Amino acid sequence: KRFFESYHEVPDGTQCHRKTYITTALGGICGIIGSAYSVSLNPADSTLEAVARVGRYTFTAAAIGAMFGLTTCVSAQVREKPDDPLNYFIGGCAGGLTLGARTHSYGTAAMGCVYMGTAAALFKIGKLEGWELFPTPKV
Amino acid sequence: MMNGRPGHEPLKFLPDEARSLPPPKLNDPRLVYMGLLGYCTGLMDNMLRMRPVMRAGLHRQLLFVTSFVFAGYFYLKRQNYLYAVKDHDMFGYIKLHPEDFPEKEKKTYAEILEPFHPVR
Amino acid sequence: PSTFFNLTMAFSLSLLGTLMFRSHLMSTLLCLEGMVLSLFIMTSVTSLNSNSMSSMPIPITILVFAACEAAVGLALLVKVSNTYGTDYVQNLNLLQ
Amino acid sequence: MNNYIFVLSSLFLVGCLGLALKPSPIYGGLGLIVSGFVGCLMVLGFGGSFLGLMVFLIYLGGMLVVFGYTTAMATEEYSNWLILGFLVLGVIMEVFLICVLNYYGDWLMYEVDDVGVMLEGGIGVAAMYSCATWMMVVAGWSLFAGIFIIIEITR
Amino acid sequence: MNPITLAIIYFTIFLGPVITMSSTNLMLMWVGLEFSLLAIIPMLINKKNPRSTEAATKYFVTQATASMIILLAIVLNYKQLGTWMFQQQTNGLILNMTLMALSMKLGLAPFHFWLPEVTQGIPLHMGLILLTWQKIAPLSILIQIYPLLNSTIILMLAITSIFMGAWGGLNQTQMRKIMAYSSIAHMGWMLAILPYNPSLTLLNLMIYIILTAPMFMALMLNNSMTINSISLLWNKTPAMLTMISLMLLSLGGLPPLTGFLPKWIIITELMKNNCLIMATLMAMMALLNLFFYTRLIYSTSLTMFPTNNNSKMMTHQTKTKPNLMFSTLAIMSTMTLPLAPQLI
Amino acid sequence: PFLDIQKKLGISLDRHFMFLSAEQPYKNAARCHAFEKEWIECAHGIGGTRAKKECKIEFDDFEECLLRYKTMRRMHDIKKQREKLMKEGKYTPPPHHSGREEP
Amino acid sequence: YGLLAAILGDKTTKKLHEYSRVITVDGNICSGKNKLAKEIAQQLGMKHYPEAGIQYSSTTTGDGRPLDIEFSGSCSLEKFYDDPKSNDGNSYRLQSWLYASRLLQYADALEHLLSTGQGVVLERSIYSDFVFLEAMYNQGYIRKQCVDHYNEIKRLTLPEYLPPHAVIYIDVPVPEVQSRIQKKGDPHEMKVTSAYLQDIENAYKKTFLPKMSEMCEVLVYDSWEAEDPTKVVEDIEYLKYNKGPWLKQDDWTFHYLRMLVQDKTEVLNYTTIPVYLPEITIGAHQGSRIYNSFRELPGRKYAPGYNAEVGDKWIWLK
Amino acid sequence: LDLIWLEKTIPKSTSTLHTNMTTLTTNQKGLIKLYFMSFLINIILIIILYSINL
Numbered sequence A: 001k002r003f004f005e006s007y008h009e010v011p012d013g014t015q016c017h018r019k020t021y022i023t024t025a026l027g028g029i030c031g032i033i034g035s036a037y038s039v040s041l042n043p044a045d046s047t048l049e050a051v052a053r054v055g056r057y058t059f060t061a062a063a064i065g066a067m068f069g070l071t072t073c074v075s076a077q078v079r080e081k082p083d084d085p086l087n088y089f090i091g092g093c094a095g096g097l098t099l100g101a102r103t104h105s106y107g108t109a110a111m112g113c114v115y116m117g118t119a120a121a122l123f124k125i126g127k128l129e130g131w132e133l134f135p136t137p138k139v
Numbered sequence B: 001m002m003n004g005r006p007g008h009e010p011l012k013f014l015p016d017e018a019r020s021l022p023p024p025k026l027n028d029p030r031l032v033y034m035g036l037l038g039y040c041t042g043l044m045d046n047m048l049r050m051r052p053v054m055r056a057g058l059h060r061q062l063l064f065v066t067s068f069v070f071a072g073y074f075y076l077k078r079q080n081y082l083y084a085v086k087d088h089d090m091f092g093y094i095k096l097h098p099e100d101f102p103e104k105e106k107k108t109y110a111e112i113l114e115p116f117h118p119v120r
Numbered sequence C: 001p002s003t004f005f006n007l008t009m010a011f012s013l014s015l016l017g018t019l020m021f022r023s024h025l026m027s028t029l030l031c032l033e034g035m036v037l038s039l040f041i042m043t044s045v046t047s048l049n050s051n052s053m054s055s056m057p058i059p060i061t062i063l064v065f066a067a068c069e070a071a072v073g074l075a076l077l078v079k080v081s082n083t084y085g086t087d088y089v090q091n092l093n094l095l096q
Numbered sequence D: 001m002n003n004y005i006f007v008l009s010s011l012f013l014v015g016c017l018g019l020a021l022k023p024s025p026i027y028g029g030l031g032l033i034v035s036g037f038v039g040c041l042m043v044l045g046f047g048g049s050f051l052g053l054m055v056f057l058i059y060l061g062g063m064l065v066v067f068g069y070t071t072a073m074a075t076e077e078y079s080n081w082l083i084l085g086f087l088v089l090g091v092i093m094e095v096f097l098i099c100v101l102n103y104y105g106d107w108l109m110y111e112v113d114d115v116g117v118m119l120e121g122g123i124g125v126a127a128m129y130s131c132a133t134w135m136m137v138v139a140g141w142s143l144f145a146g147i148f149i150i151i152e153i154t155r
Numbered sequence E: 001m002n003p004i005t006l007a008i009i010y011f012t013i014f015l016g017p018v019i020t021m022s023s024t025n026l027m028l029m030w031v032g033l034e035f036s037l038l039a040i041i042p043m044l045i046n047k048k049n050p051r052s053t054e055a056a057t058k059y060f061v062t063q064a065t066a067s068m069i070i071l072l073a074i075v076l077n078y079k080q081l082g083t084w085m086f087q088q089q090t091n092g093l094i095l096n097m098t099l100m101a102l103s104m105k106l107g108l109a110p111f112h113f114w115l116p117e118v119t120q121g122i123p124l125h126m127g128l129i130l131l132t133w134q135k136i137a138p139l140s141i142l143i144q145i146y147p148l149l150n151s152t153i154i155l156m157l158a159i160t161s162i163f164m165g166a167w168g169g170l171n172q173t174q175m176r177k178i179m180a181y182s183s184i185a186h187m188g189w190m191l192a193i194l195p196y197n198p199s200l201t202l203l204n205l206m207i208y209i210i211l212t213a214p215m216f217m218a219l220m221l222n223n224s225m226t227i228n229s230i231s232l233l234w235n236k237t238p239a240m241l242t243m244i245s246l247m248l249l250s251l252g253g254l255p256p257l258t259g260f261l262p263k264w265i266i267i268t269e270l271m272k273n274n275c276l277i278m279a280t281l282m283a284m285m286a287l288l289n290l291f292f293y294t295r296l297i298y299s300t301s302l303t304m305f306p307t308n309n310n311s312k313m314m315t316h317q318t319k320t321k322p323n324l325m326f327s328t329l330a331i332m333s334t335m336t337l338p339l340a341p342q343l344i
Numbered sequence F: 001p002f003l004d005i006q007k008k009l010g011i012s013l014d015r016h017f018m019f020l021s022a023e024q025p026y027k028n029a030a031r032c033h034a035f036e037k038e039w040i041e042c043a044h045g046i047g048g049t050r051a052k053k054e055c056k057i058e059f060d061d062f063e064e065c066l067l068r069y070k071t072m073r074r075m076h077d078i079k080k081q082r083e084k085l086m087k088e089g090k091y092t093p094p095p096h097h098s099g100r101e102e103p
Numbered sequence G: 001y002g003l004l005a006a007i008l009g010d011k012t013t014k015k016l017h018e019y020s021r022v023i024t025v026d027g028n029i030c031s032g033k034n035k036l037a038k039e040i041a042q043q044l045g046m047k048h049y050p051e052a053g054i055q056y057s058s059t060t061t062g063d064g065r066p067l068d069i070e071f072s073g074s075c076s077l078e079k080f081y082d083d084p085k086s087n088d089g090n091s092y093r094l095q096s097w098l099y100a101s102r103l104l105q106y107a108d109a110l111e112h113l114l115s116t117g118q119g120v121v122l123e124r125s126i127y128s129d130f131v132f133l134e135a136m137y138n139q140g141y142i143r144k145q146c147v148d149h150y151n152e153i154k155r156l157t158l159p160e161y162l163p164p165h166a167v168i169y170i171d172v173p174v175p176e177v178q179s180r181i182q183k184k185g186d187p188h189e190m191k192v193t194s195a196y197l198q199d200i201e202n203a204y205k206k207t208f209l210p211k212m213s214e215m216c217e218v219l220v221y222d223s224w225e226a227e228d229p230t231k232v233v234e235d236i237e238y239l240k241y242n243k244g245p246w247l248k249q250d251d252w253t254f255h256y257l258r259m260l261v262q263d264k265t266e267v268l269n270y271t272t273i274p275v276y277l278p279e280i281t282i283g284a285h286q287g288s289r290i291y292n293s294f295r296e297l298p299g300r301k302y303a304p305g306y307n308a309e310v311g312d313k314w315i316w317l318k
Numbered sequence H: 001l002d003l004i005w006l007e008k009t010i011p012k013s014t015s016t017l018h019t020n021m022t023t024l025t026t027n028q029k030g031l032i033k034l035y036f037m038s039f040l041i042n043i044i045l046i047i048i049l050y051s052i053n054l
């Protein structure tokens, strides 16, 4: 776990390699989990068919992970701005686009771009403003 | 929260300590609301059971307006206590642990420079 | 000691079982019971090496409640192979 | 043989493994019987007698007996071999895991009152009748209700 | 049911939650849970229709394995602390088990699959008990142990439930299942504030009970398990159309009605505790719940669906009345908001 | 607990037997009875939030009477290294390990 | 009547006697069953229920004065005959209302049987209604789905009620009935295509009679046996009420059945199921008007006992 | 821009987005095995959520 966290430690826009790798893993992990629920429920017809679906979901998710990581990191270096939430939006923007492609739908890319990017941007803001998620009870 | 307080009455409704608090005036708007809340329950019942809405169960209407209200005085009497305990508890702590709640002294405006953002 | 980790994993292996049906309701009702045995054994074991005699009542209360629990479970099972001629779970898919 | 305890635990684990594989309901019942036997053994190993007996006269007794009865009625159709194979697969994996800590009966009967006269299993559970008198009332109500639940659910 | 049996069962279904609540020895809390499991199964199969046996056999297996997991937590604690009850020291995994298990009996979040299906095959009446007098027991166990449970998991199960409940409800047209789905959702809010202010869980429950109990006795007054069935309410009994309208919008959070308070104070408490991330997302999809509530509103009240001639016949005959509880629980529920300060 | 119908009614059907140091049948004290007392008369009047830091000496000890793991550890080490000393023929059990003794 | 009453006595078990049975007499459009019924009734004091009518429910409820046609579902047997295969489908609406009417009649009959203990002769019953629909579908009168909708209502409601103890039956060949029609002259009843009468009896003969034979006592009578209530009555008193589902009706089982018939709103709960076949549909605008108008009739605007128009008093304390 | 583009983007899209979710989330076999394993997955993830955030 010390791993994933690393993504945040080094300043954004720097060491994109590690960023993309980490982002790709998270997506892939989600892919596995997502495929699992998708196979446990709404099962397949043959073991192979399901192994394929696991692969499909895993790769698609890994891809959205990569492009998000790559776009955000690169957008940063190029723009010479490491804390501009927009960076992430461009990244989320891209991530959605990959999802759209893997689903072969321009429309999905639309919703995907806006919704996904917005979400990622909010993550950046969240980190920038020190928003706390799942907080301990401090009343 | 307020449970676990010293002296807590394990299953009592309103500990006698609540005697010290003023009793709720019977016409307290709230108890009067409960009354109206009640009359309406009564009227509603008549309606759902298809009876003349207002001219029926004039005995029930009374049971309702008088059950809800009865409940109120004795509930409000308590909720009032609970809130009163909350201060007793809150104010006390502010003192017993004074340093944590220190009386700060603000400066007058003459000294405070507040930023001016020109609308223009 | 380790004795406890075997029993605990026995309960998890029995856990993995009840949560993965294999077309036999009876078998499940039988796996479910494998847990109760593992719980009964573990409760009895620690109570015995803690010399906590005040608690031995529990090891048995666990079994008494578990037995009836199973009685109910089997009556449902008999009810099912009276309505569908089998205990097979697939049949239980009307509530979709 | 200090390993005696570990040996038993392993057997128990293996038996539950079989039940886990969900063999024929009858095979499952048989497996549990073996495990229950192992179980009473372990409990007795610690020193508890009455306790060990119970599982025997309750599980090795009717608990599986009715199951058995039951299965005869609702289980008609007999890969068990494959299941047996996976069982061996699990056994070695189980063994492998213990061998993992291998590279990396010492303390039982942790404490005992060498001289004692009224200590023994069952005495504590005998206190269901005195100073624990709420366990057995609730258990009795459980049985007295269970009668009714089963009679209607069968009805 | 031989009235004697009816008594024994009903007593158990009622001794079941009460033992849980009263006792402190967890064991005695477990058997309280066990008795509830045994008592509910007979009533569930009263019609003994093929759907029913399916319902009970699912409810029972889901309930039984969760019961066994709760017992394992108590058995493990007994070794990590001689006590038969969770303490500050309790291993975190020990408590998390209890959360998952108890969240299965209550049916929250990723374990929300059994409830909608058992709510679909049981009568409307036993539906209420299965939804509201069987949630009191497990919640009691959680509320008692709140200081110790994890804020992260609860929140995840909370948010998930809200979403699953909402999304599930949108598609459903069977009423029993619309309610099952709502209960999953409300149950979610309740478990969200448990780690922070248990006292509010007990409000978000009562209000749910004072809202759902009138709503179901409404569904059964005409015994309509279909929206199409509840839509012809205007012909079968016109008066309940007004309150059915407000109670359902009250079940969702719309501001004038009593239903806003639980969501409002839960949001106030979560923001007081700084979860302005979590609280925001919950409130937003909470708005999805009202959409399916209002879609039903449309069919039952705001628009009059066509009815059947044979209905004129049912009008003729005197309609067996709705119990008084409906009224007292419809009004105290649709409009108590002016009295919120005391409620909390 | 959630509804204390027990304290109110004064009955004690569920409290008398929640910890090891509670009355044992025939007055036969259970194991560890020396610590749990010391760890609950300490945490009495002090709530949990403060029964978890300052009354940590008594739980760290009671966590060792029962689990008795540090002992296991120490002893296990003694065993392993003794094996190494025997390995170097440095040590072998004396008649102390095996000899006659008082009643 | 409720568990409370049942718990303390009030058991149908203590109120049943040999003469206490559900006996229906079914025949063609004119089997003289009306006559046989009254007599059998007179014989054992059986409450003789009249055949179910369009306004039987209105006579059942409140004042009992006949309702306006549109208030009673706008059904005409008269129009049934003069306009078969009508565009508006009055014939199916007539049949569906008839099934609801006998459902009310059968339930009222069962309530009298379990409370009083007296038996009941109900002439035609829900059990013997299908023959009209079978003949109507065999003819152009009703279309296939229409049939399915009636069958669905029948399957949903009829099983709950216990079967007729015995089902006295008359038979008079189609020629006979047509001729019998001519004697009581009515333009509408007169124009009933024989084949349709052929289809009605055929169903009893083939479907209804053997169906119930296994379930209840079946006494078929030739016209000659008929018109001799004494003989038929004698035979009923002769048959042994053994075979049938009635054997298992213990007191604790009857209680629930009683509480059903005791609630008319439930008896026909499934008669109003929201299946939208076009003939059955009220329609919201027409249905709302008919309701505002049926609900405004004196004594109907409020529950029985509370409407002052008809002279109810004490409303302010009820 | 009125009608189609400003109705397809904000009002209609949000209409479409969620309906898909319910359809995918609510298309369930109804079989117990499937549902249950999902319980398995959950236990696994929660076990981890605790593990990694130990």
Ligand SMILES: Nc1ncnc2c1ncn2[C@@H]1O[C@H](COP(=O)(O)OP(=O)(O)O)[C@@H](O)[C@H]1O
Pocket (backbone or CB within 6 Å): G028, G029, G030, G031, G032, G033, G034, G035, G077, G080, G094, G095, G098, G132, G133, G189
């Ligand atoms: N399903 C039905 N459809 C049309 N008419 C019916 C139906 N059931 C009963 N009837 C009417 O009932 C009448 C019975 O004939 P009637 O001579 O009045 O009594 P009985 O049948 O005892 O001789 C018939 O004229 C017939 O029109």
